[PDB]
Design a binder for this molecule. Structure first.
Ligand SMILES: *[C@@H]1O[C@H](CO)[C@@H](O)[C@H](O)[C@H]1NC(C)=O
Ligand SMILES: *[C@@H]1O[C@H](CO)[C@@H](O)[C@H](O)[C@H]1NC(C)=O
Ligand SMILES: *[C@@H]1O[C@H](CO)[C@@H](O)[C@H](O)[C@H]1NC(C)=O
Ligand SMILES: [Cl-]
Lengths: 380, 380, 380
């Protein structure tokens, strides 16, 4: 088997009207239901993706300076000026400089000076926001299939399934990210989920999200430094590419994989199915009594939870996986289990168990004592 | 007819307990249900409104300068000063200026100078945020009516309906805006929905949202420019009203209509009705076989979806509107249809069909081939 | 009694499958249900807490200045410099100052000067954000108990209850705060809920949320002022502790009580219970006919609603509390009542009634005319 059956309590057959069913669809899993004398149905969330996220802000990480120009005046000659001061492509600075007989002036004193240099971004990176319009879930329904799209705005879909006819499916996000707080930082072919404020405070030149020209950078001086003015000239220098510094700053950040302009997430949905009055098949699994083997150690998800991948090597599958979370002592914690009714449908086949441990030290207990796994975990 | 009946699968009559019903209420539509030997009931969302949204920030778009004053010193006389430098109503600037025998000093050199001018906002605009407390939906229930209010915080209401007695109605928002990302920009009698960051980065003088005085503007220099200082005087000039520039900057922005301090939105609700155990009337509509006429071409909604207004000119109404969305090729897309179970209750009467097309090029297909409408659409 | 029974319409027993039940759990209340020949069950939300909220930003409210150092040059000697200019712990300022025979220079004129002073924060405060991972609700289920944890990410829990066996409980937040808009401001042992932008615009030196060192403050000049330079020295002064000013600025702000690193909120949940097919006990209460006494006058909650605490002194309890909200005239308002089906389970025992009045002037009407309470209220 590959598919997990719903519990008898997961559906209600009305005296009149239809039959309502609740199902939880997590990546890697398969949920099945069957009506009397009707084709068996499988439900599976295939992917969660954000398509074409809009740009919140663009940051320049490598800029080059060219066309340096300076206007210097002698005492009594007033303020210098440059047309470039009005060209947003240029970074400029006004200051005072010593003038005298050595540099063509008849008086010794401070003279005004202004220098401008053309700022050209060579490499940038941008923060993008995921809005409701960008999120899409893909669910496949297989009678024995049909691929349906689900979005935050369009959560309801009617699908005709042979044997059942029309069946309504209404799904909503269950364990994702707060896209108002978390922003997607993109540098070339890579991406990371980062906090919005951290992103907005980065000390780099920037342009608004809807900017198309990409030339009138704000806060160019974050990368530019004007050297001390000489009598009639002044040099302007720039930091080198900040690509490396960004990588360092991103050390702990969650990395997201991209598919050319679109990102893949580990989605989780809660769905309600509405169909004609029909007596459905409920399933009850016995607790596994065998030992489990850890396939992949406790790992954090992209969305503040953890997953432990295990494999059942005992007997009696399909069976329910004994699971518990307890505090520093031995007090069990009810709740915190994302993968409710965790069942292994077969032996020697990896299964993901998702959970949300309490802050501090806790223990993840899997299986019954004969070979029971006791995993430590520290959070935040 | 005007009202659309629920599907048999849209309700469940318990063996014991009550009867639960699901209904979707969109603007322009009417949903009806009827119990056995009981009065027929109509449900309709009448309006979605945001009342008294609080101010996030206030921007000055037209300022006037008065009371220009300057203190200028000769070399060796140190720094000039003005009491107004401490008055937040004034914009001030310190600089150096050439002094000499021509302007009353005994020595030629740079002297410090300071100039302040009173900044007075003449016209402002403000960004307002819609919080949960500001949103209100109005639903009318008509037996054959009763007006009920629904808010994000108070989504449940018990209403006594003759024939049914008490019936519980629980509704929640279904296809709206992300008020954490979108902000309402107001200029006089007009309003627009804009992105929060774009708004927060506007290069204009501003005051915090809770500000009541409206005089101590931050960043006055966004509108003010100090001319080059003369020996003992200096002029200060200001940009003109930025009303026009804002209109240009708002070119593509979604415009929102206001009703003196309150804004109207196109709301959409999902509601659950709970009532005494009762056998309800379910309705099944046949597919329309006639031709449709486009009343209003595909138009974008305020909330990232689209609406196509059509009219049925064929026979057999009430009937279901054949509808489909397909990609650049001909692959149909399941889901994406906001107006599920789109039915025309009568001939020659406009009906709104809402949908959320995929990014890129897609086709909206309405009606069956004999005169089928094939509408192109490009998104993002 | 202490517990409130569900209404017959609050549950549905399927012909096949299970029995689904809806319950609303508010602080201070107790909801009970009972199946035929089964133990009676009580449900109660015990607390809503945010644990270990991450820091958004840190502000310094009291800083001390030490190690003031200045480099001053004579005319013709160019720009002064200090190594400390590169030390982020120091606040520095460049300017011009008059030099002459009185201070060791051979020429009279403006000379460059630079002064730096070590900035050390002595007292800070920080804004923290509540993310989904930080919120936890504690619900106790008592047969006649079991404590279950509920979080935004883990809203579903299966609990074994003697007599019923396994029962699924799925709960979600119902009347809380928008943690994307509201931020927690913490000063020592106290805390307040404040608007994010107001917080982000405070005119104080700051450090990013993930900052651990707490020494390289941004915008130190918000607290520091450089006095007018003297020939070879210059004093730097700082504002005193801004603790008092903050308290003044926080005058109207909602205060939150803390429990050493974690905050307590008034939570409200909506829960769905799924269990084996079982005929449950529904309860119908008669309207109270007696007089009520006000225990605590209308008070605002932490989340934009109001609560009126009353006591029933009449006869017939348990009975339903007559309740209504009406506008400036006498037009009743349906909806707006958070505590739906407000019942007093006993005489002389305080009961909280929560509601969300319309903006403007409204009246809260409690009880039937013989001694009816008519409470005024103004909102926003
Ligand atoms: C530098 O001179 C101007 C300054 O903007 C610029 O247009 C040009 O491309 C640069 N090179 C030349 C022509 O010197
Ligand atoms: C300008 O002078 C002061 C400067 O603030 C101001 O109070 C006054 O109204 C203005 N007009 C006068 C009296 O000159
Ligand atoms: C001031 O001098 C340096 C400046 O940073 C500092 O390290 C030291 O602790 C202070 N006190 C002394 C040694 O003068
Ligand atoms: Cl000089």
């Amino acid at each position: 088997m590959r598919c997990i059956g719903i519990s008898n309590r997961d559906f209600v057959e009305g005296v009149s009207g239809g039959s309502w069913v609740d199902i939880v669809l997590e990546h890697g899993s398969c949920v099945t239901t069957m009506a009397k004398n009707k084709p068996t149905l499988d439900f599976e969330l295939i992917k969660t993706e954000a398509k074409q996220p809009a740009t919140l802000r663009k940051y320049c990480i490598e800029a080059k300076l060219t066309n340096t120009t300076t206007e210097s005046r002698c005492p009594t000659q007033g303020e210098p000026t440059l047309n470039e001061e009005q060209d947003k492509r240029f970074v400029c600075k006004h200051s005072m400089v010593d003038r005298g007989w050595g540099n063509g002036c008849g008086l010794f004193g401070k003279g005004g000076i202004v220098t401008c240099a053309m700022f050209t971004c060579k490499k940038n990176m941008e923060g993008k926001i995921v809005q409701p319009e960008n999120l899409e879930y893909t669910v496949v329904i297989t009678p024995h299939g049909k691929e349906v799209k689900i979005t935050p705005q369009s959560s309801i879909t009617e699908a005709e399934l042979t044997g059942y006819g029309t069946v309504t499916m209404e799904c909503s996000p269950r364990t994702g990210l707060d896209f108002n707080e978390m922003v997607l930082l993109q540098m070339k072919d890579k991406a990371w989920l980062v906090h919005r404020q951290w992103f907005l405070d980065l000390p780099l030149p920037w342009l608004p999200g809807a900017d198309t020209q990409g030339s009138n950078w704000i806060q160019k001086e974050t990368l530019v430094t004007f050297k001390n003015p000489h009598a009639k000239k002044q040099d302007v220098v720039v930091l080198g590419s900040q690509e490396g510094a960004m990588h360092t700053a991103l050390t702990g950040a969650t990395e997201i994989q991209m598919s050319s302009g679109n990102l893949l997430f580990t989605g989780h949905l809660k769905c309600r199915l509405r169909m004609d009055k029909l007596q459905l098949k409920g399933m009850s699994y016995s607790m596994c009594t065998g030992k489990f083997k850890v396939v992949k150690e406790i790992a954090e998800t992209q969305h503040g939870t953890i997953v432990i991948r295990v494999q059942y090597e005992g007997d009696g599958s399909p069976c329910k996986i004994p699971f518990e979370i307890m505090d520093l002592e031995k007090r069990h914690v009810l709740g915190r289990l994302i993968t409710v009714n965790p069942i292994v449908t077969e032996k020697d086949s990896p299964v993901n168990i998702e959970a949300e441990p309490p802050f501090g030290d806790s223990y993840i207990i899997i299986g019954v004592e004969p070979g029971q796994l006791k995993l430590n975990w520290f959070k935040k």
